Symmetry: D2
Subunit: 494 residues, 4 copies
């Protein structure tokens, strides 16, 4: 148990010889150059994130090219992620470019396009056309990152709502508006999204961080927007509101993974409930065997300060204790002052947290939830990880072309590194969001199809030796899984 494991711990013991958790970095003005990216890779970046809320297709082209050049110069594989802007509810414009809202006052929000460029403190535009159909009297309208809170009183007509201003705040032009407790029915992908997703497929991005996902249906729309040529690209759904939290089971089932966007969730949902939401979403992904990213507000104060707050450190640590595959950095790397340091410290926190983490609790909890009889794939992978514990094996070798069984093995959480051997470079990149896994590329073009499998097994073991995980005498659990043929060997290392 985790509690019993805590008793045996010492903060003066040397840390684990390997880091399981993965770090996602947002590329921007601070870190776009080849040299800056090489610093990021060496600091511990596994995935490069492109924020498509800003920048032209040419800015992100520079990022793509530079990421590829930096990784190739260091002989590593780095995943490229496209984070979409997504659909947005925003206000219109104001006369004088400004509107002062005072507590107690009455105002009118309208969806009539006439008021888009002449809004005042009394009446202004909101671009979400179905606003009146979704919102009822009693509901709240949040404006400007939820700083301004309006309470709906009644329908003035079909396009206008009577509202009370509950707090004093001054909103400028085109502020973002949130509708807490309301079922927003905006389309899955925006007009800009369809262009950006097309560009993603063309440039061969590894994964999509799909913004503002609310239902399972919308996951299908993002899939269709990618089309037949983008069928292999992973779709990671960003959960940003109550709808995504409510519909999570079906969302997970249709997606390739989940991002817990704490910041976005915090705007509509109380902070203490977001903490619990993080627990829920991470564990559901853990059982599903799909990557989960802890994102936004991670080491934020380290954007301009040389070190973060003690609370920020525990936040990162607990994301790992919760069971997250990945931890994300947004502005800390994008426009930050200490990009290498923040990644280096994040890696240090993850490594420290992993030393305190009793991996067996995860393994045992996930195995307990399996329905008997298990299918071949499930039984093989859980049994293989069980053999790691029972023989005290120091490494695992998984042969997986698509990375399917690699993620399935990683689900069961062994207390040793997992080495995936694959014939596809895309698999190497895409596994960078799966914890406890490292990828060896086996060039089937240059080295044959290895149908006997011995050459790939040898390539995996070789890597494990070079990294110092195993030596002569140690055990290493080798596993193959593709009418579904499979194999498991407990190998004695030469």
């Amino acid at each position: 148990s985790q509690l019993a494991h805590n008793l045996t711990l010492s903060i003066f013991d040397p840390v684990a010889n390997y880091r399981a958790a993965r770090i996602i970095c947002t590329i921007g003005p601070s870190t776009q150059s080849v040299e800056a990216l090489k610093g990021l890779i060496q600091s511990g970046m596994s995935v490069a994130r492109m924020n498509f809320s800003h920048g032209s297709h040419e800015y992100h082209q520079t990022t793509i090219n530079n990421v590829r050049q930096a990784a190739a110069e260091l002989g590593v594989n780095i995943a490229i992620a496209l984070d979409t802007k997504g659909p947005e509810i925003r206000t219109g414009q104001f006369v004088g470019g400004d509107a002062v809202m005072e507590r107690g006052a009455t105002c009118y929000v309208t969806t009539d396009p006439a008021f888009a460029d002449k809004g005042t403190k009394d009446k202004f535009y909101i671009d979400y056309q179905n606003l009146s159909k979704v919102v009822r009297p009693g509901n709240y309208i949040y404006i400007d990152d939820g700083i301004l809170i309006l309470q709906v009183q009644s329908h003035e007509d079909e396009q206008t709502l009577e509202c009370t201003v509950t707090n004093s705040h001054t909103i400028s032009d085109r502020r973002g508006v949130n509708l807490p407790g309301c079922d927003v029915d905006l389309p899955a992908v925006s007009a800009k999204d369809r262009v950006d997703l097309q560009f993603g497929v063309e440039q061969g991005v590894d994964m999509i961080f799909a913004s503002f996902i609310r239902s399972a249906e919308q996951v299908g729309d993002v899939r269709k927007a990618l089309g037949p040529k983008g069928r292999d690209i992973m779709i990671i759904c960003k959960i940003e509101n109550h709808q995504g939290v409510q519909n999570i089971d079906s969302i997970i089932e249709e997606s390739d993974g989940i991002m817990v966007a704490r910041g976005d969730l915090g705007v509509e949902i109380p902070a203490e409930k977001v903490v619990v939401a993080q627990k829920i979403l991470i564990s559901k992904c853990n059982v599903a065997g799909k990557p989960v990213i802890c994102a936004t507000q991670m080491l934020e104060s380290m954007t301009y300060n040389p070190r973060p707050t003690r609370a920020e450190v525990s936040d990162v640590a607990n994301a790992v204790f919760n069971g997250a595959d990945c931890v994300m950095l947004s502005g800390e790397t994008a426009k930050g002052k200490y990009p290498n340091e923040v990644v280096q410290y994040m890696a240090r926190i993850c490594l420290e947290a992993q030393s305190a983490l009793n991996e067996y609790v995860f393994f045992n909890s996930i195995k307990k939830l399996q329905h008997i009889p298990m299918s071949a794939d499930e039984a093989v992978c859980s049994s293989a990880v069980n053999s790691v514990y029972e023989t005290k094996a120091k490494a695992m070798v998984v042969l997986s072309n698509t990375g399917r069984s690699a993620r399935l093995v990683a689900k069961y959480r062994p207390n040793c590194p997992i080495v995936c051997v694959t014939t596809r470079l895309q698999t190497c990149r895409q596994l960078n969001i799966t914890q406890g896994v490292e990828s060896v590329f086996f060039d089937a073009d240059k080295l044959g199809h290895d149908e006997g499998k011995e050459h790939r097994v040898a390539a995996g073991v070789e890597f494990a030796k070079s990294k110092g995980y195993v030596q002569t005498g140690d055990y290493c659990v080798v596993i193959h899984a593709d009418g579904y043929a499979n194999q498991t060997r407990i190998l004695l290392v030469e």
Copy 2:
């Protein structure tokens, strides 16, 4: 498991009708009046903390008097805690009340008392007389809450050390110094502590927060300092350095509880390791069945702002998930702008976290660690909590005079409230640092000795009904526990 419990959760389901975690508030200028204290009590204060690092005995007497008066008016029992100043290593004084230290410069730290008042940037005094004996070349000296970092180069003589100024910081008169990774051999109690602890006994405080506890022998020193008159006062040891972490096992055995002073630890130990240290100390206390306090840097930004940061909220919630009995507020309530609001919001976080917490994991882990054969006390209490889970009982009633068996039951973490019925008012107050327990005072002088135990059982069940824990048809596990013991699975009428 916790992971399995997580899947069933919903952030839209109503929260628990009960909060297990206990809130400790520091009393200062923002909260010393009778009215302000009643505000705190209603907001969710269970323990009033007095910071004896600042203020006269007349000041803390007012706190004591105002707390008791506030509690009397609301008809509740509030614990009074004395937090000692403790022994300290400080720098001397500087000519012109100032010393600007520049990066790369050389300076000299001396233990020569003649330099106490005439120090400069090139040479100054540090009051720890055994500094040269403990510190070796290569070691670091932190000054002014760890902001100024000096590296020791050589012993200039038997009193003076040559040091390199590794970073630029200007320090004023009498700044606190830290010796990371060095065994500080200062006595357990200072001159001030000795006076202050005697005051605490005379005023009848319930518990002592003893600062800078480094070893088990030092707990005995605080024990001896309190004397025979204060033998029933709890000693909660504050872990602040590496010595406290290394000696934790022997300290816990000798103490009545532990405070995890994250901020103090953070000065000398890397933040990430302090996070892990918190896990170690809390779990160790949980197994020992002794109160553990998560203190310092809890909701610090809410001292001057109406709301805290998201990260601060998760810190408080995870303290509960770690298994802390208590969470503590310092400056937030002592000199803060939103004292009622921060206690209320901390209560909200604790209640929310508790709803997501799987107590059975705690119960099962602790039970698994018990050596068979168990003694009567351990067997009775673990069996009683196990009965709760197996019959889905909605409350527990424990008859405990000293609080001993009450603390032992709470150790096993049932998924229902515990109601302790005690004949001592001091037991009511002292149980305020034990999670998931509420105390009902039974006046033995006014209502008789009740050797049948039926009147005390009735009083406990009646309380559980009035709070809405149990109703007719619900099960309630009644337990009284040399060594006499008794367990009943009661059906509520």
Copy 3:
């Protein structure tokens, strides 16, 4: 596990100081006399069986009278059982049965061995035949054919216990399926918490021989390993040449098997089958037996008037003796078909009602000291369970 328990055993070790399984003897010409019954009791007889297939009411009246006299002279309580003659369509009770059962109620018998029970509806026929005056007499159903095996769940639910008649069953059912049937009926009675008797063909060849075959010895032992409350002797004590010797030998086989038997396997198996949430009665007894294992208690003390909670505790199988303190002598006699229990009579008319319960608990602990189960320093688990008032104490013996 039993396998793990087997590893640590040694046949050369001194045997256990207490026997859990209970022996029932059939009374005939060889054992009817007062002196002969004194021999049976001392050899280890807990229950005397009357076979109403042979002999008149005056023959069985002598048996009843002599059993009571031999028991009183030795200062012990002995259960008297009435095994009916009995009569597939045939009625439950016959005309002779109804006449014989009325005689049983009048003479105050403790239990009925109802012959040839095939359905639960037939258990009710035996109930009516005993009438309102015999509502507290236990009905032990005798399974004799396939119908009894088929309807066993409903029969157990209605009966007060079961007897497995291997001989009768073996007439229509192959011997190898009877062995399995025995396993089934015993285990179901364990889960039900009702006594089960292993009867017929136990040590038959010891009727005229000084010692039985090895195969017969293993049959007695495996009955105890199956988890039977009672082992029964028919003609071995009724018409047999070595009555005292056969009871002494069966007692030795039971004592030996018990030493090899892992009680914890039984405790854990029955606890795992409990539907959560448990009710108060179920949770109190299982938790008390659990506390025995967790503290290594050397005895239990149960306060039970009807013998209900005494049986419920015995169900969960502690690895120590159970001492039941009861205010009624019929409970003492009726618990003689329950394994691992010993009864202590508490005279309420002579020593007060003891609503504080201290005197009954003290007498229980006293019996455990005199029998040498506990001494100063040992733990003893005390339990009372009658809106269902309950109590549990882990007591330190003075």
Copy 4:
């Protein structure tokens, strides 16, 4: 648990399509002929026992010759066992002569009489010499000394025979029942064959039916966890040779339907020390996979039979099919419960280093017996000894 398993049972339901326990028959005047031997085989004989307490070398030669001819005509493999006369020293002078005769004639196993200590096991081993290395030594436990030194005896031997009758001479019968539980369980942990012998269905030597007590005696031997049950005078000098073996098979099959294998599996798994060596881990993991996927058959590739015995130790709830390139392994596995052997002729078919053909042969056999059909799971396993670096392979195979 066994108790929970009992509740769900019905005596009127169909029996198992497979028998785990194995039957050993003593050959005598009633059964020496080829015709009477063929009858014994079809009645369920797996091992033919020669009692060297009687008869000359020519008599047992006739037994050896006829057993092989009967088996060859029926197309099955039957083990030949040599039960020594015995005496004190371990082996007698006659034993040494007899053991040499057994080696020459190529017997499969020795039932070594009156074994009292571990030192004596090496004496039997020496009496077999270099050419008798591959012959199993099953130690007969006949007195208190054998019981006392059982741990060291099991460690040195290849198996144990519990001789109840002999033990009953000086030890009380009730303690022999307990002693039976001890030796059987100790062999189960060790994973070495154990035989329940003497006084099985004895009355059926001259009667057409045995007593009900004798039937429960046979059943409880299986419930204890015995690999084998042995017949002496019932098949040696008895009136009903075929009937007694058929009825013993009927009891063994009946007990198997009632027996819960998972209890055995869990008990032995719980007794394993962590960390396990690769071969022990692979074998228990493969059996665990059977339960968790509800596999209907196991296939073990084992030439020596070591991993077959190791897999059988953990008691899966399905047949074990062993594929071996040695006929002597086929014979020797006849004293291990729940295993059936398929001879893969390496000279005729090839050495099959890739193992694909032996796996196919194993599955084919399981299909032909009706253990598996299209859609079922079959657990294929191979596990070499430490000397070969624990070379191992496990497959969860979907049957076509």
